[PDB]
Amino acid sequence: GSHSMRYFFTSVSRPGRGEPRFIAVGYVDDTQFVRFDSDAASQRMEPRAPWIEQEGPEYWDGETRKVKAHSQTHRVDLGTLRGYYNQSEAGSHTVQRMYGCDVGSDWRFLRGYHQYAYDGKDYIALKEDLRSWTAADMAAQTTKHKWEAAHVAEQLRAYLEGTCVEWLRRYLENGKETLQRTDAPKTHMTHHAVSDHEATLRCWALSFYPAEITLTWQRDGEDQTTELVETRPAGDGTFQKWAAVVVPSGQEQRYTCHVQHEGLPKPL
Amino acid sequence: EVQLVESGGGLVQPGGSLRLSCAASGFNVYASGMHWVRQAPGKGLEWVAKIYPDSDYTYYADSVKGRFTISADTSKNTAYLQMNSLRAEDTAVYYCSRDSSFYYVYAMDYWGQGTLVTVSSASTKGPSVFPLAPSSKSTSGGTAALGCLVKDYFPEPVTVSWNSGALTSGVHTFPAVLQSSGLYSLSSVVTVPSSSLGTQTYICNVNHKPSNTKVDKKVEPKS
Amino acid sequence: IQRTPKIQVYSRHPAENGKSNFLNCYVSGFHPSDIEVDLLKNGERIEKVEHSDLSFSKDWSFYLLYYTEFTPTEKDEYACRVNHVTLSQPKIVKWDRDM
Amino acid sequence: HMTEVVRHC
Amino acid sequence: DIQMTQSPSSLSASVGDRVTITCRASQDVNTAVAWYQQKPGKAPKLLIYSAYFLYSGVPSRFSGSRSGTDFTLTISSLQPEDFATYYCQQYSRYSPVTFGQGTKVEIKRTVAAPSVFIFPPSDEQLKSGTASVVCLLNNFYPREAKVQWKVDNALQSGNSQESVTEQDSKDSTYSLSSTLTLSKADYEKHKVYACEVTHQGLSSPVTKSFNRGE
DSSP states (O other): OOEEEEEEEEEEOOTTTSSOEEEEEEEETTEEEEEEETTSSSOSOEEOSTTTTTSOHHHHHHHHHHHHHHHHHHHHHHHHHHHHHTOOSSSOOEEEEEEEEEEOTTOOEEEEEEEEEETTEEEEEEOTTSSOEEEOSHHHHHHHHHHHHTTHHHHHHHIIIIIHHHHHHHHHHHTHHHHSOOOOOEEEEEEEEOSSSEEEEEEEEEEESSSOOEEEEEETTEEEOOEEOOOEEOSSSOEEEEEEEEEETTOGGGEEEEEEOTTSSSOO | OOEEEEEOOOEEOTTOOEEEEEEEESSOGGGSOEEEEEEOTTSOOEEEEEEOSSSOOEEEOGGGBTTEEEEEEGGGTEEEEEEOSOOGGGOEEEEEEEOOSSSSOOSOOEEOOOEEEEESSOOOBOOEEEEEOOOSSOOOSSEEEEEEEEEEEBSSOOEEEEGGGTBOTTEEEOOOEEOTTSOEEEEEEEEEEGGGGGTOOOEEEEEEGGGTEEEEEEOOOOO | OOBOOEEEEEESSOOOTTSOEEEEEEEEEEBSSOOEEEEEETTEEOSOOEEOOOEEOTTSOEEEEEEEEEOOOSSOOEEEEEEOTTOSSOEEEEOOTTO | OOOSOOOOO | OOOEEESOSEEEEETTOOEEEEEEESSOOTTOEEEEEEOTTSOOEEEEETTTEEOTTSOTTEEEEEETTEEEEEESSOOGGGOEEEEEEEOOTTSOOEEOOOEEEEEEOOOBOOEEEEEOOOHHHHTTTEEEEEEEEEEEBSSOEEEEEEETTEEOOSSEEEEEOOOOTTTOOEEEEEEEEEEHHHHTTOSEEEEEEEETTOSSOEEEEEESOO
16 A cells, blocks of 8 residues: 655744744654644643654654754744745734655655645745755745755755655554554445435445545446535544435435445445 | 406505406307406405396496496407496405306306405505525525515515526415515525535516516525 | 635534534634634533644645534534634534434 | 754745 | 305315315205315316206315205315315306305324524615514424514514415425514624424424524
8 A cells, every 4th residue: 555654834923922833743644643732731742643652762852853943943934934025024924834755555765745835825845856946936936046055955855765764664563553454434325305306315434544535426327427525534543424416306226326445345 | 268367457546446357268258147256365255246248237246336337348258347436345356257158057167367456545666575595504404495585565466486487396485474564575485405505596586567576586695 | 815614513423312422523625724613512612622733735725623522412402613714704513413 | 753954944 | 135154164184084064045045056166366166066066077076965954065085185265155147146255174184393494684685774584484284383583582572473375285284484573773783583483293492593693
């Protein structure tokens, strides 16, 4: 199976509220395993999974120091980016950064990422090649020239191909029964009349671990191309989703729901 | 095929005159009897007048003798009710019916659809149409209700349709209530699949012919 | 940019009256991050409400799960009230079992 | 294991 | 002046039951008696002429008989579409015909709880200086329901009017509307608007509400 490790950092300015809010979460696949919150009591990188708690004191001092260094940097970035766009000091603004790496079935490096946003819009991103930056506007081109000078891409490329992949392999081994599991979706269908001549068929998929799932309708033979909600967390590690069709009554028997998920041998 | 169509109903001032007309089709007025029967709002049927065109013979109810005159024009195949010195009590739906041509049926076999006569100190006013927007806070079983509220109109007959009549399933148009104001207001609702709300146009067509008002109001979820 | 939140209110396990469960309110696709979320029992705010650590999707829009332990009954009404800068006034979404 | 490589901007 | 008294001014019976309406004449009218079925705001249809004779094309579950000086219309097997008012007339070809007061026939069916909905007034209406709040009770039996309005949990009197549909010709249910009329000024003074419904098919009263925002 394909696997990934991602880090998500959000920094938000709080004019008049004092220091800006910093939140960081670390995922392996769809499983959160670490977090930091500037508002939380500890001021430490906290564990959010069982298999990570077996890592030693040196690991936790290291991650905390690194995340504190990320926050201190963002605390600057917020101010720098206001200057570039000439914005007011009294307004709240949002900086977001996501990085991580991708490993194939064979656990070898597949891809790397490092993206950066300002007020929910693309700012600057590392390309596919991991040697180069895409700058979204004139402001980010300033940052491009600064980061080309400071050799950022070259030192990120070392992390993404090396440290990122080797610790992802280590996490996959530590938390094997949690991360290398595949919970197949528990499925059923519900019926409600909505009219004299119409009725809703809802197709449920629940308690499935990997969020990658496809719910599709068919009538007789061809895919029924209709309501579909975003995949949602159950809150216990597994995920949920439903899909519905409004169908003429007395003709519910000619509709079928199709479920594709890596936990299922073949589609249901 | 026997058919009777009444016309000429409307609003009239007390003391006014009005003439209703009954277009006969698929027979000769000359060979049959015509009656007028009327029905005051939420009352029973009241026979009004009868005529045999061939020999002018006319008969009237005590309540309208000397005010109403029933007549016929053979050349139009039409019978009439000339109504004079009209009072508030004359307010009603007026039906035109005939005697059966068979003779072996002792009854009024064919009736028209009826025409409403409103006897009131004038007061024609068109309606305002407000959307009853389907609620975007559940209030659904998987079905949503939406409607339009047809408010403050006079004299009476208001027609509501949905999507120019294409939508009839689950429509409830309410009997008009008379308000404290002396004006009418009714509601038309329909239940629809709550998932259709994103996709489907819903329009209520309100027609108040007495004021020459047609309104087409689109009804959709608010946000 | 301002993106309006998509709200989903649902149970962790299929709802069975008298059986303990978890009531979820999943708010997603929103920007900015500041949002206010209450779970309601018969219109009145449930206090002990926990929530996920803020994260975001590939379009940079945020998501949060708010949740509380509850035992459903037939007459008890449950809801989620969300206030955001994109919302003119607070949006209230009722818990239906077959949503 | 986060990254050590974070440059201001 | 001959006057016919329709014996029962109203009645309700279940689908399949036998129903007899009587019509009593003030003088002997021989058998010159006809019966009609008028469905609400429709033109009357002839059922029975000369007291006993079925008019052609009328279902045979209708019959007409005499019993001394009273005349009886009988529906041997009541059907949902037979919801109507029924009228007996004394017919004379060459003088004044007169009608009975009529008999309303309700269909009695299985208890059905209403589906309740509440609608706030539209902004289009509020700009005209009045707010109509509507509470709608959908497809229920029987016709008796209680709709109370509570504005910030104060019970209301005299500012609501309701309208009840005619019984449906297939499922034999009622729909009801209660409208709560307020001045924009008085409406904008309060937050929570609730209609609370008591019906036979509801274990406990049901309330549908909104706060004046959303």
